[PDB]
């Protein structure tokens, strides 16, 4: 699961994904969108979790069950691979939008 570290870092530094940025580049603290408080995506940006699922196909991973979403899977894989973790606060807001806050390991 090296590709996951890579995918996250490339996504963050590209600035391309709605809700996906650093809060502390030195401490490696970053955000992904929350399931919950959603804002419509601007013109310039791409869907982070969509891209995540695509990347997962690229590494020959099985399609996620119909009971699952890219967001769930992303969190889970970050955890089982111990590649980032969460502390309170688990979330932060940008306007209306809930962001899930993470600390890379």
Curated annotation (Swiss-Prot):
DNA-binding interval(s): 1-97
Outcome of swapping residue 79 to A: About 50% loss of transcriptional regulation and DNA-binding
Lineage: superkingdom: Viruses
Subcellular location: Host nucleus; Host cytoplasm
Family from the record: Belongs to the IRF family.
Functional summary from the UniProt entry: DNA-binding transcription factor that plays a role in the modulation of host immune response. Acts by interacting with host EIF2AK2/PKR and inhibiting its activation. In turn, EIF2AK2/PKR substrates including EIF2S1 or histone H2A are not phosphorylated. Inhibits type I interferon signaling by targeting host IRF3 during viral reactivation from latency. Attenuates the transcriptional activity of host FOXO3 via activation of the AKT1 signaling pathway, inhibiting FOXO3-mediated apoptosis.
Oligomeric form and interacting partners: Interacts with host EIF2AK2/PKR. Interacts with host USP7.
Name of the protein in its database record: Viral IRF2-like protein
Gene, per the UniProt record: vIRF-2
């Amino acid at each position: 699961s090296e590709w996951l570290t890579d995918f996250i870092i490339d996504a963050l530094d590209s600035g391309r994904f709605w809700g996906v940025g650093w809060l502390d580049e030195q401490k490696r603290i970053f955000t992904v969108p929350g399931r919950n408080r959603r804002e419509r995506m601007p013109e310039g940006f791409d869907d982070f979790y969509e891209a995540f699922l695509e990347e997962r196909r690229r590494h020959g991973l099985p399609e996620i069950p119909e009971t699952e979403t890219g967001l769930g899977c992303f969190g889970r894989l970050l955890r089982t691979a111990n590649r980032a973790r969460q502390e309170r606060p688990f979330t932060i807001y940008k306007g209306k939008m809930k962001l899930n806050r993470w600390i890379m390991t």
